Amino acid sequence: TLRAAVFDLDGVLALPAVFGVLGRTEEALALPRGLLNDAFQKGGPEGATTRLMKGEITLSQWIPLMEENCRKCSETAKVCLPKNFSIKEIFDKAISARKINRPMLQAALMLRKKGFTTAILTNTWLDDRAERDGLAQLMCELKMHFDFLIESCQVGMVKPEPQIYKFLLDTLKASPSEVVFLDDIGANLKPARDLGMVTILVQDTDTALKELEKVTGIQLLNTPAPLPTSCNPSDMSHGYVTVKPRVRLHFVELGSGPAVCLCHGFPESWYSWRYQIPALAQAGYRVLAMDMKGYGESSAPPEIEEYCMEVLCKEMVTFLDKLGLSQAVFIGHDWGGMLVWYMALFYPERVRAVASLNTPFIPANPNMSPLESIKANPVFDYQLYFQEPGVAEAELEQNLSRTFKSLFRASDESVLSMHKVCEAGGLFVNSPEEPSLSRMVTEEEIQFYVQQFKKSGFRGPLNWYRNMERNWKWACKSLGRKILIPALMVTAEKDFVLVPQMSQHMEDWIPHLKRGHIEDCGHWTQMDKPTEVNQILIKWLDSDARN
Amino acid sequence: TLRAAVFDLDGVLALPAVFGVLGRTEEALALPRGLLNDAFQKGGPEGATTRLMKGEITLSQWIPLMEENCRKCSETAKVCLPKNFSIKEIFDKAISARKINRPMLQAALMLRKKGFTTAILTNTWLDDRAERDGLAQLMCELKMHFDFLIESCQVGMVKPEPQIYKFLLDTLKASPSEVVFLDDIGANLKPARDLGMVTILVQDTDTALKELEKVTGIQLLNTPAPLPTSCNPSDMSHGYVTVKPRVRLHFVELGSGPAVCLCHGFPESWYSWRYQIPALAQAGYRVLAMDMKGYGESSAPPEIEEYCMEVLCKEMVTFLDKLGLSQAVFIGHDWGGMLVWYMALFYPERVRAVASLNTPFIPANPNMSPLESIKANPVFDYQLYFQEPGVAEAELEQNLSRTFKSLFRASDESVLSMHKVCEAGGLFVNSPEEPSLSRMVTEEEIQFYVQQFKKSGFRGPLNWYRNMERNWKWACKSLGRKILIPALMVTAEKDFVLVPQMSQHMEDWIPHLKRGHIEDCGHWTQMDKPTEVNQILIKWLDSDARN
Ligand SMILES: O=C(Nc1ccc(I)cc1)NC1CCCCC1
Ligand SMILES: O=C(Nc1ccc(I)cc1)NC1CCCCC1
Ligand SMILES: [Mg+2]
Ligand SMILES: [Mg+2]
């Protein structure tokens, strides 16, 4: 029966409740109880606060009217007010102190995930204070998790006026009986109740969630930690930059602040960063998630030399030039990680900081040819298999769904054997035709990769492996240098190709290197342990990248 | 004969010359003359400075080696060094002090404009200092004005090695005889000369430009102020955001820093901001030049209600949401200006600051209908002509080139009569078939607008005029508010439709309003006086928008 849940902002989705700062101010200042509450509601429906809440006047216009009420109220109470009493100072502090009530947001997220239509119904104001950005960010973060945000100052109505409730129902396209409404004010629940909808008087979160759990019949409390926010492709801002006549790079962009350029590995896409994009943006950064050359919506020329690291890096510099960015933090994973280490080696001027997941920095060996080196490591046999043009393309392109379902797997799952691929004659020779779905990805997500790769296939992607000698020669030019800019190396315990031990000597070339290590994490680091990645990158960014 | 000009960086395109800080340090510190110069060049071709200049080692790795040389040199000279002598401090200061030599850049720009192939040839280093961003920005600004940038640390060669010169010529695809090379170091000119190319020993800029002027035969000195940098459509980063199922907004983006959203008027496009986009980005802002709904690459639905200000503004908020921006400075012109005033009135939380060119803020009159008001102003007759769907579309779409050539005109040019358009039966009834080309625009630029408008035509654009009553009603909801966020109103003296006097009472609703006024400027403010606009917006942004 229940199909929708409506949450109040102050006191329910955000705490401490701003309205609840009037009482704390009275006690702190030793003023008569409710004095500030009276002045706040002075005049009732005709009062300054109701005009403010309906959108008739702005908050800054209101502040002066509230001070006047505060004097009249004290006047009638025969009490003075502090020497530097200031309504603006009181509300600036109260508003900035208010934060998102996480467990309540989680319950909303869960209900929505199970079919519920969710909305926020709040009496609020048009904030023109010089500190307004604070509230804007709060609303923006919350706003994105609900189907509707109904603000009184926007619709010209205010709880408890029944009109706002009829509006609500109209917006919900639902009848009272199928709506739960939580608020921390009894008076605002009465109208909802009269209309016949379920109502919860929210005092303490746990108790409210218990009632909410009971009435909805869905487990909301004591529930496991959910995964971080992921993004929907069609809700992203999509950018395109032509760095050369036949080369255009695509990227997804989100957030403000220092620029953070994410570089995925093989054979992935910008979407591989779906878990950290919202998180890093929320943390105060401008994220640019790339579709590296050869992938997705980025150009994919056929020539092999078009994918040697020298060229790819140059293009990334041009990419920064075109976007008008003097610098950007470069964070890469797998082949992308190899690319950022070289961006730091050849263009320190352009890299604010560098971070790599799984991929270590190992200076080229002037004496041994790359191919000789590759043959010396059993697990790198598949790389030799990738050399001859067309062979790997055919196998990987035959059944796209199978390819990604076979590759994208957690360590405790049936991970692909990487031993005698050439001898075996293929990469999936010993794999089932219909691989099971990994715990790390949904059927829809796999199909996203499937569609992306239907455009250019694996030729451009595979070409990243066909410039060993060329990249080797270019790398030898930096053997005398050292990475001296902020750097972070993150190792993955269960990555059997890009093993942690492989990075044990990195400090010799990167003295100030900072580290990170993730337990029980496979090769697909971002998908495997998204919560751990975000925590590690954000902590590093705030200390070594933002300054 | 001459077809290319090559410029050195230090001492030629940038001053003061960083290398010239060694002498100033010796005198300041009362050290033996040339002591620092000796240590700087210690070891010659095998010295630390040459390795640094070829890319073998980074600047930070170099600093320690230069200090060692400084001690050995003083040792042999029997002289001590200050107590807190610091090579890093000396170069950090010297490098940040170095700036672009504008008149020299102007000469390069002029020569290039007249067919010359231009390039920068410089001995430089891989900067990994914590202050590296400074140099990166300098290079980026200069870099964009030349065909080639050849840095020694990038190509592994250094002047005076003749190999670098052969490389140069090879890059230029030209023979010595047709190349002019300016440098402030004789030794670096000798090789060029031996190869037979023209060379100029640059001491003082004026003298160098005189020789350069004489040898090229092109006026470079005492020349008029050039127009600010404009952008090439295909070199821009193009962004797309879906704010609704059938509505996707396109914008050009450039720069880092606070977000600045530019909103053009009727019937224009993002390109109308071509002169301020590079400038505002260069000034330290992240510019987002919109193609407003109905134009260019943005969606253009047919329905009239899709263009009422309420909807357009909502979409702009969603646009900010999708991009992950809590705020943005909104700067509009013409209809765009009308849009930002309303963004400030209904979404103060989202507007960091608001600025309008030509369009004043006039609160709706609750008693008079919009149409009544429009008929009361003779110059607004054309608006009545725009009402009936299809009529204006036919005239404006018949000959696109003529439409823009007829509209885009400076005040001293044949500006379109805006008196009895309806009576006249049209907007171009008294206009020539082949309008002359305005001084404000080239034939290519007109054709840019032509192509943009071939996609959707004038229906969506014109619909901006067909929501008078609707916008009026929505506006009446804000009659009790006031604009209290940072605001700037810029008036144009010769704009005969959006007249300056029209904004004379704005302070009644915007007390803290800041102003700007441009003399001898028509309606197309950005195109008309681009240099004045940039100066006014940048000055305001730095004082009221950046904080
Ligand atoms: O090879 C990979 N990743 C990879 C290879 C095969 C598969 I199936 C999945 C990932 N990484 C490279 C990064 C650059 C240095 C050599 C190893
Ligand atoms: O009408 C214009 N601009 C315009 C009109 C006709 C032509 I031909 C060119 C610009 N501006 C509007 C802005 C919003 C308030 C009314 C006037
Ligand atoms: Mg509440
Ligand atoms: Mg020089």
Q: Which of A360, A368, A302 is nearest to A335 (CA)?
A: A360
- B12 alpha carbon, closest ligand: 4
Residues A273 and A421 in one domain: yes
For residue A227, tell me if it sits in a domain: no
Pick the atom of ligand 1 nearest to A338's CA. Answer: 14
**Would you say A401 and A514 are in contact if contact means Cβ atoms under 8 Å apart?**
no
CA distance B227 to chain A (A): 20
User: Which of A58, A137, A321 faces B326 most closely, judged by CB atoms?
Assistant: A137
State the amino acid at position A400 in one-letter form: L
Query: How many other C-beta atoms can be found within 10 angstroms of the C-beta atom of residue A204?
Result: 8
Contacts of B391 (CB under 8 A, 6+ apart): B385
Q: Which residues contact B1 (CB under 8 A, 6 or more apart)?
A: B177, B178
Q: Which helix (H) or strand (E) holds B183?
A: strand B179-183
User: Which two three-digit tokens encode residue B134?
Assistant: 């400074």
Whole-angstrom distance, CA of residue B326 vs CA of residue A543? 23
* Count of C-beta atoms within a 10 Å radius of residue B291: 23
With beta carbons less than 8 A apart as the criterion, state whether A6 and A168 touch.
yes
Residue whose tokens read 């609707």: B470
For chain A, count helices (H), then strands (E).
Answer: 24, 15
What 3-state class would DSSP assign to A49? helix
State both tokens at B403.
Answer: 């439409």
Question: Tokens 């409506």 correspond to what residue?
Answer: A6
Question: Is the sign of the CA dihedral A337, A338, A339, A343 positive or negative?
Answer: positive
Q: Are A142 and A70 in contact (CB under 8 A)?
A: no
Provide the 3-class DSSP secondary structure of residue B184: coil
CA-CA distance, A273 to A535, in Å (whole number)? 14
Q: Are residues B101 and B87 in the same domain?
A: no
A79 touches chain B (CB under 8 A): no
Length of chain A (residues): 547
Q: Is B499 exposed, middle or buried (0-12, 13-18, 19+ CB in 10 A)?
A: middle
Which residue is it, tokens 């508010």?
A: B481
Residues 6+ apart with CB under 8 A from B175: B169
What is the rounded distance in angstroms from the CA atom of residue A230 to the CA atom of residue A216?
26
- B228 belongs to a structural domain: no
Cβ-based burial of A498 (10 A; exposed 0-12, middle 13-18, buried ≥19): buried
Q: If you measure CA to CA, which chain B residue comes closest to A57?
A: B481
Residue B349 to residue A135, Cβ atoms within 8 A: yes
Q: How far is the CA of A328 from the centre of ligand 3 (A)?
A: 42
Sheet holding A148-151, edge to edge: A148-151, A117-122, A4-7, A179-183, A198-201
- The answer to whether B120 and B180 are in contact (CB under 8 A) is no
Give the position, in ligand 1's atom list, of the atom nearest the Cα of A382: 6
Locate B534 and state its tokens. 């940039």
The encoded tokens of residue B199 equal 């060379």
Q: Which residues line ligand 1 (CB under 6 A)?
A: A 265-266, 334-335, 338, 359, 382, 407, 416, 497
Helix (H, G, I), strand (E, B) or coil at B330: strand
B382 is in an annotated binding site: yes
d(C-alpha B140, C-alpha B343), whole Å = 34
Q: How far is Cα B542 from Cα A527, in angstroms, rounded to an integer?
A: 42
Contact B237/A128, CB-based, under 8 Å?
Answer: no
Runs of H (alpha helix) within B347-380 = 370-375
B77-89: buried (b, 16+ CB within 10 Å) or exposed (e) per residue? eeeebeeebebbe
At A402, which helix (H) or strand (E)? Answer: helix A400-407
Our measurement of the distance from residue A53's CA atom to the centroid of its chain's CA atoms, rounded to an integer in Å, reads: 32
A149 touches B at CB < 8 Å? no
Domain total of chain B:
3
For residue B121, which of B136, B134, B108 has the smallest C-alpha distance? B108
Residue B213 amino acid letter: E
Q: How far off is chain A from B326, nearest CA to CA, in Å? A: 5
Query: B227 lies in a domain?
Result: no
How far away is chain B from the Cα of A237, in angstroms, using its nearest Cα? Answer: 5
For residue B532, how many C-alpha atoms fall within 13 Å in the half-sphere facing its CB? Answer: 18
Q: How far apart are CA A144 and CA A159, in angstroms?
A: 23
- Enumerate residues 388 to 447 of chain B having a beta carbon within 8 A of any beta carbon in chain A: none
One domain, residues B152 and B28: no
- Residue A168: which of A1, A19, A4, A51 has the closest Cα? A4
**Distance (Å, rounded) from C-alpha B430 to C-alpha B60?**
70
Q: Which residues does B284 contact at the CB level (< 8 Å), separation at least 6?
A: B255, B256, B257, B258, B542, B546
* Whether residues B7 and B69 fall in one domain: no
List C-alpha distances in Å: A14 to A321, B13, B325, B326.
42, 56, 21, 18
What is the spatial distance between Cα A181 and Cα A187, in angstroms, rounded to a whole number?
Answer: 13
**Could you please report the per-residue DSSP string of B233-269?**
GGGSEEEEEEEETTEEEEEEEE-SSSEEEEE--TT--
CB B172 within 8 A of CB B119: yes
Active site residue A334: yes
Find the residues whose C-beta lies inside 6 A of ligand 2.
Answer: B 265-266, 334-335, 338, 359, 382, 407, 416, 497
Say yes or no for a CB contact (<8 Å) between B321 and A143: yes
Strand stretches in A215-285, DSSP E: 237-244, 247-254, 259-263
Q: How far apart are alpha carbons A504 and A428 in whole angstroms?
A: 32
Q: Is A167 exposed, middle or buried (0-12, 13-18, 19+ CB in 10 A)?
A: middle
Residue B240 is assigned to a ligand binding site: no
- Name the helix (H) or strand (E) containing A492: strand A487-492
Does the annotation place B8 within a ligand binding site? yes
What is the 3 state secondary structure string of B455-478? HHCCHHHHHHHCCHHHHHHHHHHH
Distance CA A3, CA B499 (A): 55
**Cβ contacts of A503 within 8 Å, gap of 6 or more:** A360, A361, A489, A491
Helix (H) or strand (E) holding B15: strand B14-15
B203 and B73 in a common domain: no
- Among A128, A234, A348, select the one facing B127 at the smallest CB separation: A348
CA end-to-end span of chain A: 53
Q: Count CA within 13 A, CB hemisphere, residue A34.
A: 5
Distance from C-alpha of B354 to C-alpha of B483, rounded to nearest angstrom: 9
Residue indicated by tokens 């701003």: A18
E strands, A302-429, where?
Answer: 328-333, 351-357
Range of the domain at B162: 1-16+97-217
Q: What torsion, rounded to 10 degrees, do the Cα atoms A192, A193, A197, A201 define?
A: 80
Whether B37 and B134 map to the same domain: the answer is: no
Ligand nearest to the CA of A364: 1
The answer to whether A386 and A392 are in contact (CB under 8 A) is: yes
A418 neighbors A364 (Cβ within 8 angstroms) = no
> Coil, helix or strand for A46?
helix
Give SS3 for B276: helix
Query: Length of chain B in residues, anyone?
Result: 547
**For this structure, is A183 an active site residue?**
no
Burial B502-534 (b: 16+ CB within 10 A, else e): bbeebeebbeebbebebeebbbbbbbbbbebbb
Neighbours of B270 (CB within 10 A): 28
Question: How far is it, in rounded angstroms, from Cα B336 to Cα B357?
Answer: 9
Is B230 among the domain residues?
no
Query: Do B294 and B456 form a contact (C-beta atoms < 8 A)?
Result: yes
- Which residue in the list A334, A381, A528, A544 is annotated as catalytic? A334
Nearest Cα residue to B417 out of B429, B402, B408: B429
User: Of B328, B295, B323, which is closest to residue B453 (Cα–Cα)?
Assistant: B295
Binding-site residue numbers of A for Mg(2+) are 8, 10, 184
B2 and B144 part of one domain: yes
CB of A234 within 8 Å of any CB in chain B? yes
How are the residues of chain B apportioned to helix, strand and coil, as percentages rounded to the nearest 5? 50, 15, 40
Domain contains B491:
yes
Q: Are B381 and B421 in contact (CB under 8 A)?
A: yes
Judgement on whether residues B26 and B142 belong to the same structural domain of the protein = no
- A179: CATH: 3.40.50.1000
Residue type, B482: K
Both structure tokens of B348: 């103060």
Tokens of B317: 């908020």
Of B136, B154, B239, the CB nearest to A237: B239
Angle between helical axes of A59-77 and A87-97 (0-180°, round to 10): 120
Q: Are residues A90 and A107 in the same domain?
A: no
The verdict on B338 and B480 lying in the same domain is yes
CB contact under 8 A, A238 and B237: no
- Identify which of A152, A225, A221, A233 has the alpha carbon closest to the alpha carbon of residue A188: A152
H/E stretch holding B405 reads helix B400-407
Helix locations, A19-161, DSSP H: 21-28, 35-40, 48-54, 59-77, 87-97, 102-113, 133-143, 152-155
End-to-end Cα spacing for chain B: 53
Domain identity same for A171 and A294 = no
User: Is A231 part of a structural domain of the chain?
Assistant: no
Q: Give the single-character DSSP code of B441.
A: -
Q: How far is the CA of A523 from the centre of ligand 1 (A)?
A: 9
Q: Mark whether B465 is an active-site residue.
A: yes
**A223 in a domain, yes or no?**
no
| Residue ending a domain, choose from A63, A96, A129 | A96
Residue A173 φ/ψ region, left for φ over 0, alpha for ψ in the -120 to 50 degree band, beta for the rest: left
Q: Which residues of A11-44 are buried (b: 16+ CB within 10 A; e: fewer)?
A: bbbbbebbebbbeebbeeeebeeebbbbbbbbee
Residue that is written with structure tokens 């885009």 in the block: B408
Last residue of a domain, which of A69, A96, A123? A96
Last residue of a domain, one of B66, B96, B126: B96
* Residue of B237, B229, B13 lying closest to B120 (CA atoms): B13
Please answer whether residues A472 and A478 qualify as being in contact, where contact means their C-beta atoms are separated by less than 8 angstroms. no
The verdict on B151 and B240 lying in the same domain is no
Number of C-alpha atoms within 13 angstroms, CB side, residue A385? 22
The reply, when asked if residue B10 is annotated as ligand binding, is yes
Domain CATH number, residue A26: 1.10.150.240
Which atom in ligand 1 lies closest to the alpha carbon of residue A335? 13
Q: State the closest ligand 2 atom to the C-alpha of B416, by its place in the atom list counted from 1.
A: 8
Report the C-alpha gap between A47 and A469 in whole angstroms: 78
Confirm if A211 and A5 have CB atoms less than 8 A apart. no
Cα–Cα distance measured from residue A524 to residue A530, given in angstroms and rounded to the nearest whole number: 10
Contact yes or no for A27/A65 (Cβ under 8 A): no
Query: How far is it, in rounded angstroms, from Cα B530 to Cα B477?
Result: 36
Residue B524 main-chain phi, psi, to 5 deg:
-80, 60
DSSP, res A227: P
Number of H helices and E strands in chain B, helices first, is: 24, 15
Distance from the alpha carbon of residue A11 to the mean position of ligand 3, in angstroms = 5
Mutational pocket test of ligand 2: of B266, B339, B362, B527, the residue with most ligand atoms within 8 Å of the beta carbon: B266
**Dihedral (Cα; A478, A481, A485, A491), 10-degree rounding:** 70
Residue B131 CA to residue B95 CA, distance in Å, equals 10
B490 neighbors B525 (Cβ within 8 angstroms) = yes
The structure's method of determination equals X-ray
Distance from CA of B58 to the nearest CA of A (A): 6
Residue A222 belongs to a domain: no
Contact B239, B266 (CB under 8 A): no
Residue B268 sits in a domain whose CATH number is 3.40.50.1820
Q: Is B528 annotated as a binding residue?
A: no
Give the span between the Cα atoms of A382 and A426, in whole angstroms: 9
For A144, counting Cβ atoms within 10 Å of its Cβ (0-12 exposed, 13-18 middle, 19+ buried), the class is: middle
